[PDB]
Amino acid sequence: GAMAQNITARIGEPLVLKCKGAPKKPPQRLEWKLNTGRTEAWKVLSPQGGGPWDSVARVLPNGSLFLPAVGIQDEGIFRCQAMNRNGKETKSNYRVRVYQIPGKPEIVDSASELTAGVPNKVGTCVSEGSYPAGTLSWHLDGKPLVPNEKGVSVKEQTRRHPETGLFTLQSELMVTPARGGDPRPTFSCSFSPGLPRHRALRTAPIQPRVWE
Ligand SMILES: Cc1cccc2c(-c3ccccc3)c(C(=O)O)[nH]c12
Ligand SMILES: O=C(O)c1ccc(Oc2cccc(O)c2)cc1
Ligand SMILES: O=C(O)c1ccc(Oc2cccc(O)c2)cc1
Protein backbone atom coordinates (compact mmCIF):
# COMPACT_ATOMS: atom_id res chain seq x y z
CA GLY A 1 0.00 0.00 0.00
CA ALA A 2 1.00 3.58 0.79
CA MET A 3 3.05 5.15 3.56
CA ALA A 4 1.03 4.83 6.75
CA GLN A 5 1.31 5.21 10.48
CA ASN A 6 1.08 1.80 12.14
CA ILE A 7 -1.51 1.77 14.94
CA THR A 8 -1.83 -1.10 17.43
CA ALA A 9 -5.28 -1.17 19.03
CA ARG A 10 -6.36 -3.40 21.91
CA ILE A 11 -9.63 -5.31 21.50
CA GLY A 12 -12.38 -3.80 23.59
CA GLU A 13 -10.63 -0.42 24.06
CA PRO A 14 -11.73 2.80 22.32
CA LEU A 15 -9.69 4.15 19.43
CA VAL A 16 -9.34 7.74 18.22
CA LEU A 17 -7.75 8.29 14.81
CA LYS A 18 -6.71 11.81 14.00
CA CYS A 19 -7.62 13.65 10.82
CA LYS A 20 -4.68 15.96 10.36
CA GLY A 21 -5.29 19.28 8.69
CA ALA A 22 -8.97 19.51 9.33
CA PRO A 23 -10.73 22.57 10.78
CA LYS A 24 -11.09 22.28 14.55
CA LYS A 25 -14.92 22.27 14.45
CA PRO A 26 -17.69 22.20 11.84
CA PRO A 27 -18.04 23.46 9.11
CA GLN A 28 -15.51 20.88 7.84
CA ARG A 29 -14.71 19.45 4.38
CA LEU A 30 -13.30 16.05 5.27
CA GLU A 31 -13.89 12.42 4.41
CA TRP A 32 -12.91 9.14 6.08
CA LYS A 33 -12.37 5.99 3.99
CA LEU A 34 -11.80 2.64 5.64
CA ASN A 35 -11.13 -0.89 4.40
CA THR A 36 -11.44 -3.45 7.20
CA GLY A 37 -12.82 -6.90 7.91
CA ARG A 38 -16.12 -5.08 8.28
CA THR A 39 -16.07 -3.66 4.76
CA GLU A 40 -16.39 -4.76 1.18
CA ALA A 41 -13.35 -2.75 -0.06
CA TRP A 42 -13.62 0.98 0.82
CA LYS A 43 -16.41 2.43 2.96
CA VAL A 44 -16.85 6.22 3.17
CA LEU A 45 -17.71 7.89 6.49
CA SER A 46 -18.77 11.55 6.73
CA PRO A 47 -19.30 14.05 9.58
CA GLN A 48 -23.07 13.72 9.11
CA GLY A 49 -22.88 10.01 9.94
CA GLY A 50 -26.06 7.96 10.03
CA GLY A 51 -27.01 4.34 9.49
CA PRO A 52 -25.64 1.20 11.12
CA TRP A 53 -22.05 2.48 10.99
CA ASP A 54 -22.96 4.92 13.78
CA SER A 55 -22.81 1.94 16.17
CA VAL A 56 -19.22 1.13 15.11
CA ALA A 57 -17.31 4.23 14.04
CA ARG A 58 -18.30 7.86 14.02
CA VAL A 59 -16.65 11.18 13.12
CA LEU A 60 -16.06 13.42 16.17
CA PRO A 61 -16.73 17.20 16.27
CA ASN A 62 -13.02 17.84 15.66
CA GLY A 63 -13.08 15.48 12.66
CA SER A 64 -11.28 12.53 14.27
CA LEU A 65 -12.75 9.05 13.84
CA PHE A 66 -13.89 7.35 17.06
CA LEU A 67 -14.47 3.64 17.68
CA PRO A 68 -15.99 3.01 21.14
CA ALA A 69 -14.70 -0.58 21.33
CA VAL A 70 -12.27 -2.05 18.79
CA GLY A 71 -13.04 -5.57 17.57
CA ILE A 72 -11.07 -8.17 15.61
CA GLN A 73 -12.83 -7.06 12.42
CA ASP A 74 -11.52 -3.43 12.70
CA GLU A 75 -8.13 -4.49 11.25
CA GLY A 76 -7.50 -2.91 7.93
CA ILE A 77 -6.79 0.66 6.68
CA PHE A 78 -8.18 4.05 7.82
CA ARG A 79 -7.68 7.22 5.73
CA CYS A 80 -8.76 10.81 6.10
CA GLN A 81 -8.70 13.59 3.53
CA ALA A 82 -9.46 17.12 4.69
CA MET A 83 -9.35 20.68 3.33
CA ASN A 84 -8.51 23.62 5.55
CA ARG A 85 -10.44 26.90 5.26
CA ASN A 86 -7.93 28.20 2.69
CA GLY A 87 -8.03 25.03 0.59
CA LYS A 88 -4.88 22.97 1.13
CA GLU A 89 -5.63 19.24 1.14
CA THR A 90 -4.17 17.04 3.89
CA LYS A 91 -4.15 13.24 4.00
CA SER A 92 -3.87 10.83 6.95
CA ASN A 93 -3.11 7.13 6.43
CA TYR A 94 -3.34 4.56 9.24
CA ARG A 95 -2.73 0.80 9.26
CA VAL A 96 -4.70 -0.51 12.24
CA ARG A 97 -3.61 -3.90 13.68
CA VAL A 98 -5.62 -5.27 16.63
CA TYR A 99 -4.43 -7.29 19.61
CA GLN A 100 -5.39 -8.74 22.99
CA ILE A 101 -3.13 -9.66 25.91
CA PRO A 102 -3.70 -13.18 27.30
CA GLY A 103 -3.89 -14.05 30.94
CA LYS A 104 -0.71 -15.02 32.74
CA PRO A 105 0.67 -18.31 31.37
CA GLU A 106 0.21 -21.28 33.69
CA ILE A 107 2.10 -24.54 33.98
CA VAL A 108 -0.53 -27.21 34.45
CA ASP A 109 0.56 -30.81 34.96
CA SER A 110 4.24 -30.78 35.90
CA ALA A 111 6.60 -33.66 36.61
CA SER A 112 8.17 -33.82 40.05
CA GLU A 113 10.86 -36.36 39.08
CA LEU A 114 12.86 -36.81 35.87
CA THR A 115 15.17 -39.70 34.98
CA ALA A 116 18.41 -38.88 33.19
CA GLY A 117 19.18 -40.39 29.80
CA VAL A 118 15.53 -41.12 28.98
CA PRO A 119 12.93 -38.73 27.50
CA ASN A 120 10.73 -37.24 30.24
CA LYS A 121 7.47 -35.32 30.08
CA VAL A 122 8.24 -32.11 32.01
CA GLY A 123 4.94 -30.23 31.95
CA THR A 124 2.20 -28.51 29.99
CA CYS A 125 1.91 -24.75 29.61
CA VAL A 126 -1.42 -23.05 28.91
CA SER A 127 -2.17 -19.47 27.82
CA GLU A 128 -5.71 -18.15 27.32
CA GLY A 129 -7.06 -15.09 25.55
CA SER A 130 -4.46 -13.84 23.08
CA TYR A 131 -4.97 -12.12 19.73
CA PRO A 132 -3.15 -12.83 17.46
CA ALA A 133 -2.29 -16.38 18.59
CA GLY A 134 1.27 -15.73 19.73
CA THR A 135 3.66 -18.46 20.80
CA LEU A 136 4.57 -20.39 23.94
CA SER A 137 8.25 -21.11 24.60
CA TRP A 138 10.22 -22.96 27.27
CA HIS A 139 13.27 -21.96 29.32
CA LEU A 140 15.80 -23.94 31.37
CA ASP A 141 17.64 -22.03 34.13
CA GLY A 142 16.94 -18.77 32.31
CA LYS A 143 18.25 -20.02 28.94
CA PRO A 144 15.89 -20.61 25.98
CA LEU A 145 15.15 -24.24 25.13
CA VAL A 146 15.35 -24.94 21.38
CA PRO A 147 13.18 -27.83 20.09
CA ASN A 148 14.77 -30.90 18.48
CA GLU A 149 18.19 -29.66 19.58
CA LYS A 150 19.75 -32.46 21.67
CA GLY A 151 16.94 -33.96 23.73
CA VAL A 152 14.30 -31.18 23.62
CA SER A 153 10.91 -31.96 22.05
CA VAL A 154 8.00 -29.51 22.06
CA LYS A 155 4.49 -30.15 20.84
CA GLU A 156 1.91 -27.37 20.58
CA GLN A 157 -1.84 -26.89 20.15
CA THR A 158 -3.92 -23.81 19.27
CA ARG A 159 -7.63 -23.54 20.06
CA ARG A 160 -10.01 -20.70 19.25
CA HIS A 161 -12.84 -19.40 21.42
CA PRO A 162 -16.02 -20.03 19.38
CA GLU A 163 -17.52 -16.58 19.98
CA THR A 164 -14.73 -14.10 20.86
CA GLY A 165 -12.12 -15.44 18.43
CA LEU A 166 -9.38 -15.22 21.07
CA PHE A 167 -6.72 -17.93 21.10
CA THR A 168 -5.77 -20.50 23.72
CA LEU A 169 -2.31 -22.08 23.44
CA GLN A 170 -1.09 -25.30 25.06
CA SER A 171 2.54 -26.49 24.87
CA GLU A 172 4.01 -29.82 26.05
CA LEU A 173 7.75 -30.05 26.80
CA MET A 174 9.79 -33.26 26.85
CA VAL A 175 13.49 -33.32 27.74
CA THR A 176 16.11 -36.04 27.77
CA PRO A 177 18.36 -34.79 30.60
CA ALA A 178 22.06 -35.52 30.37
CA ARG A 179 23.96 -37.60 32.92
CA GLY A 180 25.94 -35.39 35.27
CA GLY A 181 23.67 -32.34 35.12
CA ASP A 182 22.00 -30.12 37.68
CA PRO A 183 19.88 -32.51 39.80
CA ARG A 184 17.36 -29.69 40.45
CA PRO A 185 16.88 -27.84 37.14
CA THR A 186 14.48 -24.90 36.87
CA PHE A 187 12.02 -24.88 33.95
CA SER A 188 9.77 -21.93 33.04
CA CYS A 189 7.26 -21.16 30.29
CA SER A 190 6.68 -17.81 28.58
CA PHE A 191 4.22 -16.24 26.14
CA SER A 192 5.57 -14.22 23.21
CA PRO A 193 3.11 -11.83 21.52
CA GLY A 194 2.53 -11.64 17.79
CA LEU A 195 2.65 -7.84 17.43
CA PRO A 196 6.09 -6.27 18.02
CA ARG A 197 7.06 -4.31 21.18
CA HIS A 198 5.02 -6.24 23.82
CA ARG A 199 6.46 -7.75 27.00
CA ALA A 200 6.90 -11.47 27.66
CA LEU A 201 4.71 -12.91 30.42
CA ARG A 202 6.45 -15.74 32.29
CA THR A 203 5.23 -18.58 34.47
CA ALA A 204 6.29 -19.53 37.94
CA PRO A 205 9.19 -21.98 37.53
CA ILE A 206 8.98 -25.70 38.21
CA GLN A 207 11.95 -27.41 39.88
CA PRO A 208 11.84 -31.19 39.41
CA ARG A 209 14.39 -33.63 40.80
CA VAL A 210 16.68 -35.43 38.33
CA TRP A 211 17.77 -38.98 39.21
CA GLU A 212 21.08 -40.27 37.86
C1 LIG B 1 -2.27 7.42 -0.27
C2 LIG B 1 -3.36 8.03 0.62
C3 LIG B 1 -3.09 8.36 2.06
C4 LIG B 1 -4.17 8.95 2.89
C5 LIG B 1 -5.52 9.22 2.29
C6 LIG B 1 -5.80 8.87 0.77
C7 LIG B 1 -6.90 9.01 -0.03
C8 LIG B 1 -8.27 9.58 0.38
C9 LIG B 1 -8.87 9.28 1.75
C10 LIG B 1 -10.23 9.87 2.14
C11 LIG B 1 -11.00 10.74 1.15
C12 LIG B 1 -10.40 11.04 -0.22
C13 LIG B 1 -9.04 10.46 -0.60
C14 LIG B 1 -6.56 8.53 -1.29
C15 LIG B 1 -7.46 8.47 -2.52
O1 LIG B 1 -8.49 7.74 -2.50
O2 LIG B 1 -7.18 9.16 -3.54
N1 LIG B 1 -5.26 8.11 -1.26
C16 LIG B 1 -4.78 8.32 0.00
O1 LIG C 1 -19.24 19.80 0.87
C1 LIG C 1 -18.06 19.81 0.41
O2 LIG C 1 -17.68 20.74 -0.35
C2 LIG C 1 -17.11 18.68 0.78
C3 LIG C 1 -17.43 17.82 1.81
C4 LIG C 1 -16.57 16.79 2.15
C5 LIG C 1 -15.38 16.63 1.47
O3 LIG C 1 -14.53 15.58 1.84
C6 LIG C 1 -13.39 15.51 1.03
C7 LIG C 1 -13.39 14.69 -0.09
C8 LIG C 1 -12.26 14.61 -0.89
C9 LIG C 1 -11.13 15.34 -0.56
C10 LIG C 1 -11.13 16.15 0.56
O4 LIG C 1 -9.98 16.89 0.89
C11 LIG C 1 -12.25 16.23 1.36
C12 LIG C 1 -15.06 17.50 0.43
C13 LIG C 1 -15.92 18.53 0.09
O1 LIG D 1 -22.76 4.03 19.05
C1 LIG D 1 -22.98 5.20 19.46
O2 LIG D 1 -24.08 5.46 20.03
C2 LIG D 1 -21.94 6.30 19.30
C3 LIG D 1 -20.60 6.03 19.03
C4 LIG D 1 -19.69 7.07 18.90
C5 LIG D 1 -20.10 8.40 19.02
O3 LIG D 1 -19.14 9.44 18.90
C6 LIG D 1 -19.56 10.73 18.48
C7 LIG D 1 -19.35 11.11 17.17
C8 LIG D 1 -19.74 12.36 16.72
C9 LIG D 1 -20.32 13.28 17.56
C10 LIG D 1 -20.52 12.94 18.88
O4 LIG D 1 -21.10 13.86 19.75
C11 LIG D 1 -20.13 11.68 19.32
C12 LIG D 1 -21.44 8.65 19.28
C13 LIG D 1 -22.35 7.62 19.43
UniProtKB/Swiss-Prot annotation:
It is found in: Cell membrane; Cell projection, Phagocytic cup; Early endosome; Nucleus. It is a single-pass type I membrane protein. This is Advanced glycosylation end product-specific receptor. Induction: Induced in T cells by antigen stimulation and by the S100B ligand. Induced in trophoblasts by DNA damage. One of its GO terms (biological process) is negative regulation of long-term synaptic depression. The gene is AGER. GO terms for cellular component: apical plasma membrane; cell junction; cell surface; early endosome; extracellular region; fibrillar center; nucleus; phagocytic cup. Residues 105-202 form the Ig-like C2-type domain. Phosphorylated on its cytoplasmic domain by PKCzeta/PRKCZ upon ligand binding. Phosphorylated by ATM following DNA damage. Endothelial cells. Increased expression in pre-term labor and preeclampsia placentas compared to controls. It comes from Homo sapiens (Human). Constitutive homodimer; disulfide-linked. Forms homooligomers. Interacts with S100A1 and APP. Interacts with S100B, S100A12 and S100A14. Interacts with TIRAP. Interacts with HMGB1. Interacts with LGP2; this interaction plays an important role in AGER-mediated pro-inflammatory responses and cytokine release. Interacts with double-strand break repair protein MRE11 which is a core component of the MRN complex. The interaction enhances MRE11 endonuclease activity and promotes DNA repair. The chain holds residues 23 to 231 of 404 of the full protein. It comes from the Eukaryota. Glycans are attached at residues 6, 62. Disulfide bonds join 19-80, 125-189. Residues 4-212 are extracellular.
